[PDB]
Subunit: 174 residues, 2 copies
């Protein structure tokens, strides 16, 4: 990461910890399963972010004893406060980096074979994400509510529309 | 990867900084995360390395053979996965910690925002249509399709939420 890391990255972690304590392992998997689709870019910064939040007193790492001991992170009231402050801020515009759309933009410097391949790869990718995501929300959000389901359904709506569009562009090319 | 984007823009023909900015602001804002202001120092860097040349024609930038070779090498690399950050979807994901009034407003705001993006792209298409190529139009159409589906899904969500209350 870098000096330009968004501070909002911290609220991804605090928000996750709002429901219950989680191990590092579990935070990483939720990130890969769910947040890669709508708050990506920050995966490698999970432990650095956890360590910083602990250093500031926003979370605490505890040995839960019972069975095998498990180290888990718990949010503190100071972290709750930072999370709730985040939630009252203005909603930031989407930020997207799509290498694929830029390749299409510069497509006139490629060739038809290569463009066709890239499109087919992109279709296959988005199709896989669609399939993955549903099952991952049932794993991570047992007790999923109407508002939580919006993130899923918007994502699937958007991916599916991208897939449909690309299939049509492919038809036209072939 | 600001470098490659600038060099790609200069492949067709030479451009002023103002020209490059317009492309960033009108096209790339929807699928590139670097702003023109952030990218601007790369012009001097590419100059210093001899990948582009600057002349006082207003200052125009011309790509060199060496810049062309860099760009072609970029086009050969594997395509990196999309990287999306959507504060809106995160608010929804953490929506159990908000309230109905706030959530409804967030959804109406997002519907308006995305409708505005679609209207702006449709306005730009009427501006671009004669020249736009098949491959340049893929970006445009994927964008419209994506935002349109988001708008239609969100309208259904708002209606259902309003029917709950």
């Amino acid at each position: 990461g870098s000096a330009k890391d968004p501070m909002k990255g911290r609220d991804v972690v605090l928000g996750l910890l709002m429901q219950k304590e989680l191990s590092g392992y579990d935070i990483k998997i939720v990130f890969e399963d769910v947040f890669t689709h709508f708050f990506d870019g920050s995966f490698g910064m999970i432990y650095p972010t956890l360590r910083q939040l602990e250093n500031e007193g926003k979370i605490k790492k505890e040995v839960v004893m019972q069975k095998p001991n498990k180290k888990m992170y718990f949010i503190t009231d100071e972290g709750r406060e930072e999370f709730y402050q985040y939630m009252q801020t203005p909603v930031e515009k989407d930020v997207l980096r799509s290498d694929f759309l830029m390749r299409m933009y510069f497509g006139n410097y490629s060739d038809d074979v290569t463009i066709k391949k890239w499109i087919k790869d992109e279709i296959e990718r988005k199709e896989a994400y669609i399939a993955d995501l549903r099952l991952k929300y049932e794993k991570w959000r047992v007790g999923i509510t109407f508002v939580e389901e919006i993130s899923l359904d918007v994502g699937i709506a958007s991916y599916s529309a991208q897939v449909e569009t690309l299939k049509k562009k492919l038809e036209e090319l072939e």
